[PDB]
């Protein structure tokens, strides 16, 4: 897919730039009983028809990548993530986007289980909701018994330009 | 999955099981970035196994109609919002074919009973279990040609969704 390039490297070209983040929170809860969910990975429906990460352009008001990503979770989540900020500290990787000179981060937060679902219940009163943002979803982790219901047959589905694969990194990396 | 008649599949011996959904919907006088229409609000869901489908479930015995069991199912996977209306034998659809035989349902809503329905669907008991998030189809397909609702249909479904909402858009005018 598209080009992996450095944080210093992309944010030298003079270019629209994108960054998008994967929220996460711990899960003791468990499927049926049985299956753990491990972990609660909050997606969204898009207007594409496509699955993503929520965030958005960043733009010359945006006195740094993380203001704006900051910006566009509270457009597109509401003010239950005015709880957080997504530090750099939290940055992942970049890739080069479809689009033209468009640039795309990818960021990971750990929330706590206890903030991650007032952003689910704060997602209806949001100002992109029915509009940018259609739903909000969760990512199956658990995959059991067919031996391809679960986390494979999710990932069957539409994924904005890269971020099944920014998907699969997180749950590698940050070890399942 | 095929089609049957509701009361071919209500003729059915007792290794059958019955199963009820219902597509939810509202008009909606909003535009997608106050230029693209919307036109309706349609709520569909992300189940367990990652494949989109609609809410509802079995009906069992216990329960005392096919209405009751998908009423309940609602509630259970939808949250207390679904006892605002009743989806009754009048918003039926159809009935698709393990032994099981499947039935649709549409049921239009006002703007406001929908919007309040999306609020409570985090508080519904299969939320993070069986339900993992509800979704609005868009209806709308974007001037890149491919975007909007026809990559909505990429996605991997349950069933007879799929060809259960196709079958609700043309079917009361929504297409
Ligand atoms: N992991 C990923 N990996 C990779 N790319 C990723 C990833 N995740 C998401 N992306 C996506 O991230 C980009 C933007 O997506 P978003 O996440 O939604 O960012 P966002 O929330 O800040 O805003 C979305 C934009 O809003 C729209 O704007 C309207 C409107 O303002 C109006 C005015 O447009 P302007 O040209 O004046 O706006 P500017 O773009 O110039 O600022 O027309 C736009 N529009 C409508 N249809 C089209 C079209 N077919 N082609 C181009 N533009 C279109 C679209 O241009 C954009 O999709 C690409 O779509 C890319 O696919
Ligand atoms: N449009 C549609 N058109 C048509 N069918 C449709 C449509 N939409 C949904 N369906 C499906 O609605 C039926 C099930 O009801 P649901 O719609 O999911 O609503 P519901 O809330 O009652 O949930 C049914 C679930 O099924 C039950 O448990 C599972 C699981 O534990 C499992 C436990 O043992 P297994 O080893 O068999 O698990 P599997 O190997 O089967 O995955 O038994 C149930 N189950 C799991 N997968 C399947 C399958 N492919 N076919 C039939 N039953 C299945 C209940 O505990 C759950 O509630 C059929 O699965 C049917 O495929
Ligand atoms: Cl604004
Ligand atoms: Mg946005
Ligand atoms: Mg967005
Ligand atoms: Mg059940
Ligand atoms: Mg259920
Ligand atoms: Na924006
Ligand atoms: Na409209």
Same mark, same amino acid.
């Given at each position: 897919?598209?080009?992996?390039?450095?944080?210093?490297?992309?944010?030298?070209?003079?270019?629209?730039? !994108?960054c998008h983040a994967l929220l996460?929170?711990?899960?003791?809860?468990?499927?049926? /009983?049985?299956?753990?969910?491990? @972990?609660?990975?909050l997606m969204q429906?898009?207007? +594409?028809?496509?699955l993503g990460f929520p965030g958005?352009? !960043?733009?010359?008001? +945006?006195?740094?990548?993380?203001?704006?990503?900051?910006?566009?979770?509270?457009?597109?989540?509401?003010?239950?993530?005015?709880?957080? $900020?997504?530090? $750099?500290?939290?940055?992942?990787?970049?890739? !080069? /986007?479809?689009?033209?000179?468009?640039?795309?981060?990818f960021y990971a937060?750990?929330?706590? *289980?206890?903030?991650?679902?007032?952003?689910?219940?704060?997602?209806?009163?949001?100002?992109?909701?029915?509009?940018?943002?259609?739903?909000?979803?969760? !990512?199956? *982790? @658990?995959?059991?018994?067919?031996?391809? /219901?679960?986390?494979?047959?999710? *990932?069957?589905?539409?994924?904005i330009?890269?971020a099944?694969?920014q998907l699969?990194?997180?749950?590698?990396? *940050?070890?399942?």
């Amino acid at each position: 897919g598209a080009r992996r390039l450095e944080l210093g490297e992309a944010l030298a070209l003079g270019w629209r730039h !994108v960054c998008h983040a994967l929220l996460y929170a711990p899960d003791p809860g468990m499927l049926f /009983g049985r299956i753990p969910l491990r @972990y609660a990975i909050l997606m969204q429906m898009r207007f +594409d028809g496509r699955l993503g990460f929520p965030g958005g352009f !960043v733009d010359t008001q +945006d006195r740094s990548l993380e203001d704006g990503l900051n910006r566009e979770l509270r457009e597109e989540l509401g003010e239950a993530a005015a709880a957080f $900020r997504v530090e $750099r500290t939290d940055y992942r990787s970049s890739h !080069v /986007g479809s689009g033209p000179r468009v640039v795309a981060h990818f960021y990971a937060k750990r929330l706590t *289980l206890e903030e991650l679902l007032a952003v689910e219940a704060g997602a209806t009163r949001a100002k992109d909701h029915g509009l940018e943002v259609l739903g909000l979803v969760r !990512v199956p *982790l @658990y995959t059991l018994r067919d031996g391809v /219901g679960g986390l494979p047959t999710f *990932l069957e589905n539409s994924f904005i330009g890269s971020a099944r694969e920014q998907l699969l990194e997180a749950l590698q990396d *940050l070890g399942l």
